[model samples]
Target chain A: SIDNCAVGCPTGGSSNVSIVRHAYTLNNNSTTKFANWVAYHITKDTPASGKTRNWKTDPALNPADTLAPADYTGANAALKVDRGHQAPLASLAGVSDWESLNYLSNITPQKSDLNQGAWARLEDQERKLIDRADISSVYTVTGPLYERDMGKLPGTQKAHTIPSAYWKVIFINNSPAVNHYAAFLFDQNTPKGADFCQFRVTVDEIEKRTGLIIWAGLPDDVQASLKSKPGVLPELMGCKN
Target chain B: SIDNCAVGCPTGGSSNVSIVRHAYTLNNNSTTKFANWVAYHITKDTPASGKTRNWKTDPALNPADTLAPADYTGANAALKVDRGHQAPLASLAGVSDWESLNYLSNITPQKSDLNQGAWARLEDQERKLIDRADISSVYTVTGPLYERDMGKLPGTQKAHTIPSAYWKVIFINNSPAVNHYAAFLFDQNTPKGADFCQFRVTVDEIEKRTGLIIWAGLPDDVQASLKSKPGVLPELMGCKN
Candidate 1:
């Protein structure tokens, strides 16, 4: 894949994952396989305790079924993400409720801080780069690094888990869009008990951890695209070359 | 009252407040007014929605009831505020056991972000402000700002009918350790919209809103003692300031 009209391998996402309440049924709507996207439902604690639940086998459900929004929401007013509209609900209006289409599950806990706050603007810049060319492609969520640090636990620990330091790449075949997505999450908290806490690292650091040369000395097409979206690649996935 | 003080008037808080849950309660061994603050158990939604409740009317008391530590928790590590070792059973020892004391109603919603993150920090700073000096102090928690906002009911054109912000402040008399106490609620929600929301805020802003200048600019001796041992002020307010 690196030689024939090629590009570099993408990396940076966590391998871990884990949600609740009301009878939530999420139907995937993309004609494209959801094979790449993982979903989760953030749950609130019940019986009132100091712990949060992980989205796993237990999949705690609320006995009192009610479609209630979160009591504390800071996520609203942020940038909007695209929802897959291929699949439609048979029970509702036969037509898909595009609004509800992006149910909470469909929401891959993206690096909103990364994507919109800093990276999304980068995406807009990338758009400008690809717009100059005829590149066309698709994008999806991934991890092993992205949301790898998330947990249901409250406090600063929660904010630290979001992969704010990471970014994604999108590639398309000779269309007006970039084809590779890459980014790194700056780890801030130590696991359980380690040394101290705070932001650390760079893309070279991410690349070493993931074993992927994000911005290797590449073919002409890829290099040109990389140049279009500079300061994103070589550092994102460990590459001194 | 603003000019009568030999010291100065208390400052007010701000309009922008955020909320979250905390993992642990910074236990107070003194009599700080903050250690004993409470909010009116106001429900969200409105009476038309069937979840009716008065924001001002304090609920009936469970004179003989108590709460186990298990009963109250910082949801997902997000701590909910409740009277510590005073009301609802008297101490961390009481929290360790005793089921009747752990009623949900007795537990007050707290912003873990502010409580543990900033507010507790403020308490420490305030403690130092009033260290050995004997002074009269007051703390208050304004009515809740409800999670739903309930801004501008569907038909009513009334202005300022529903508040965008609310809080509570406690008062204390000087000398000694912190003693926790309970507060009387002054606002009630219209029984229909009953999904009460979580809230959080910072100290500097609280000072700006309430016009209650706390220990922020107090003398040195008071500052040192308050920072090292903040529990004293609230303890004085457990019954009266």
Candidate 2:
């Protein structure tokens, strides 16, 4: 499938096992047993679909290598961490591929405080952007941030290193001629009281820190100017009074 | 002398032997022989004074203890550090207190790149605000940030520890009942090409880092709202054209 990476793809993203679904693409990482990132486009046409839900291992990967439901048993509940979803569940609710959103490859360990607080708030804001139909479509890229000497999960030994941060970039295709971008960097342990907007930084800083070249599809001059500056959501979307 | 700290003085700032002058107030730090901060208010009627210049030791401090001409010899020349001004000289050019602006207590060691680059731009912007007479009055607080184990100048043995960062806060009083605040933090090592606005941060962050309570005279609720958020210069001043 052609890579519809409006917000830019990971460095070696093309090589990942791309599981293209009706709602999103899961760039599955076989070794890490997670998706390096998930790409999706939300538009006004997307339905507010079914209520059914199921969490499972990604059958798309090799059975021997895929993560089972037991692997996430202590997540959020006993482990004091959240089984955070990179491609949020509600955003895909009305689509045929909504159930695919529950695969383990789409999850990561986030601090419970951030997941329920700012991250959740950001996710809701994204849905509201689509619900308002102010823009034709919005493309999003969400991923984990790992460090060289990161710590592993409690029982995974050296098998799985927990990420220190997470990132998300949104590209609003306001019209055929207009485009606006916003990026955020959330520490894994961000406090519940901190405003998510405070974490907003330049996409250039994010690319340098995460080694991901965002907005590769845009022209060099446009990319340079856009990436060099931090963005304000209300201002970018023209929703501020 | 009467306390004229329009930008809110630091805690215990009074004992610093405040040197009140026509252009500004220098909160002299006896230990460092420098002004912990320089506070001043700029008005539309502020004059565009003479061109004669003289840099001198502050007579208000003990002659034996205060920094003199010799103390600044190796500052920017031999030390590769810039003789940065806490209260910028040009901002007070036309006022009667302009000569007092050259006192040693108003200077500190800043990275040469920053002094010539972003900091210079900020100084220019402040002057433009006065030239345009966009606001009724502008209150400024400029100071250096020190660390416990900061490095000393190359030639100075036990004296003159260089500051790690510098901070400035500006309060634009559009009218007696209206005001806007902007705060900035500049690292001594910041690159010359960086934009000054990129360094805009919350006044609360600056207070936490530098132990200074800025805009203390404002109502508590007003101060709370103003200090907790990042600032936008164009938006604050309505001078974006």
Candidate 3:
């Protein structure tokens, strides 16, 4: 079902490397040895009865083709970076799906603080959304931000392109009414525990900067309205009516 | 239970005309007779069962004490100012709660363009958010802004203070996650249909300008993260990433 991105993915133009997997979709970037972006759907139905955090490389790609755990060696202590999961493992809680999540294709180099700190907090928050029944499902697209000063893995010198930042856009699918959305942008190098809400932005801003038309499958009217407005985080919705 | 604001309302400090009704709360301004701010909660159970659309003067406040619907007679067509609702009626859709929303203490003068156009659109959007189940409930605090050059109603001259701007802070409450918040500001004189999303701001900014601690019921940590960030409209959350 994920084969044709046009069917489920947002459309602006066309993707170059569309790789459909059992649990998610990946648009790989061989040049960067990472995914241009990874898209997945997390819902109450997403299996959560598993604990297999077994991470492994994707056999589909040659051994030296994509990034490896080795690449992350001493990354934290040496360069203050972490092997960030574009498709966070926590979202893929299915027993069988956990292994697929570790594929190098789903990994990226992330600032240590962002990975274990704010971004981690964000991922935890997303899972909590389902736990609390505030939402039934969430469609997410996680990717890298290649701003002007895109860096490289500290020890690798120029081996791989280090993203300037990372982005995640979450489309909340609720029942009885229209869908709700939220977009987040994070500097790969922010301090630990920075409030993730501070980085909330419009999807249109991300589209303008990334040249990617996210949520393409959504109707044009919905897209127009949803893309232009700044988002409210879910937890703050009922604090002050 | 809604009668005691201390139970459901967000706290900051003491209020002047702190009137807690069956459906809402008002912090009135004795000089203006209109509330400086009105706060209420919107939820799935808020009652979309009534359509009285009834508007009246507050019996609690003497006739000369507050601006009544009479003050808005021809105020729209003649002076281009509408008898704006600090607490919108649509939000009080319960079977018997409609009458409370009609109180003059909840009224203010808004630019006809903004009151009937963009601001109205914003109110509709909030309701739609509930309909879609994107959020379970919302807490909103709406108020007037009196900055430099505070204008008076055009027809009545100095009959009442015509606020130069208006503000609304929405705190989103979802279970199992940290609270999310959004702040909006609107110029009293903007053209009809001006993009309301352009006005997204930080709760901190609103507090700084209004001198009110918003969402005070939220723990200090939640307030620290939720209030300091710029907010996005529900529609535009995932358009960018």
Candidate 4:
């Protein structure tokens, strides 16, 4: 399905380098030392990775653009933010190249609260929807948004720009001609225990904020329908808004 | 005297292109379309040439990085922020090529209150200090500071990053072997009618926030003396703190 996305990866982004892997495709920006966006498809939940966390500089990227463990030495001392995965780690845990997702290129300076709270719940919903008879597979495109200046990663080189927020657009296919989709925008300052469904936004708003044409591969009319309004509500995923 | 600075321009800044003009030198940045810093010498008051304002994109910079007047078409609608000058236009008005300072590279998205209130007063003091018999010349480096997330200019492309604050470092040469220096940091949310002197900071603090080595041209010993202490005060400029 990587060859032809159900909902294609976005385009019209700023300067970035696309790094394709078996399970995910990430467009990395050298200036920010992080992925501009990552598009991945999910069919079913894998068994637990049972793998200890191992972070590495993405080998496919230029040396200057990659981040090392040392770069984040004191980054978590304040519990302000830690390395967060754009492509949810739990989803790819059992894949053969699962470790590749640990690459810093796929990581970002994410507020710990969002990572563990509403955002974590949203990632679970991405996988949880599969058990329902109405949904067979899920396709997602996720990336950082820089509406406000988050300042650079603390105590690091100036190149590593911090993101002000994160955005996610999800598509689900169950043999329908038009796929169901939902878009979300979460501020980095999002307080803990917030509900993910409450963060739902129109896909067009996400494109306007990020300058990426989400669902670009789809025909204009189809994109118009899918992006203009909220497609799948949280109730469909067995979660309350 | 351009070859040698009274206090000297700073170095160790991130990616930027330095543009030296007759009255000031501005290091223009592509990412922000503003100066990283503008170091200028103020020796005496010049007769006003009675020039009008004209904003132009820097001819020396790339089109992708530079900002045009049209780009800022709706930028000042809210009395929120306008094309505020980092290098005071009044300071360079009498120079032969004064128009160069009108380039967007010398401008930044500055809050209207700060621009008209404390910041304007600070620029006035730069010229006011010259009347003092104790001060024969003044050397100052001023630039924007991004300590927090100030949102970007509205309805513009993604690259135009906005700054949350500004910094100024002043050194007066009244024949003292050691220069009298003062550092200041003003938040964009600064209250109207705030006193510039009330924001006194050490040169070392400015460098730490900006990743620049202030007075890098001076000898290590001289830099130590000029940077570690708050040298000048409002009283020296005939103003109350």
lDDT of 4 at A231: 44
List of chain B TM-scores, one per candidate:
0.27, 0.86, 0.83, 0.90
List residue ranges in candidate 1 displaced over 4 A.
A1-101, A106-116, A138-164, A172-241, B1-241
Kindly list the per-residue Cα lDDT of model 1 for residues B47-108, writing each as its tens digit.
01122221221122222222223333333243223222112122111222223223322233
Each candidate's number of clashing pairs is 132, 4, 33, 0
lDDT of each residue in A1-241, candidate 3, tens digit only: 4432322564442345576775678876666677777788776666464555445667777666577665666667766776778987766666345577877788877888899887888887776666544456666887887785555555453356678888888756531014445788888777897877677777788888777888666656556765777554443432221
Where model 3 places Cα greater than 4 Å from the true spot, the runs are A1-36, A39-102, A105-140, A143-219, A227-241, B3-23, B41-55, B60-82, B90-94, B109-139, B146-164, B171-182, B186-200, B234-241
lDDT of 3 at B143: 85
Candidate 2 segments exceeding 4 Å error: A1-241, B1-4, B14-16, B47-52, B148-150, B154-158, B174-177, B234-241
Model-by-model DockQ, in order: 0.00, 0.02, 0.14, 0.01
- Tell me, by TM-score, which candidate is best: 3
RMSD of each: 27.0, 14.2, 7.8, 25.7
Error of 2 at B187 (Å): 0.6
TM-score of each: 0.21, 0.48, 0.59, 0.48
Better of 1 and 3 by TM-score: 3
Worst 10 residues of 1 chain B by lDDT: B39-48
lDDT of candidate 1 at residue B110, scale 0 to 100: 44
lDDT of each: 0.26, 0.66, 0.66, 0.71
* Candidate 4 residue spans exceeding 4 A from truth: A15-17, A45-49, A174-177, A239-241, B1-241
* RMSD over all Cα atoms, model 1: 27.0
Give one digit per residue, the lDDT tens place, for model 3 in B31-73.
6656777887777777464466567878776676577665666
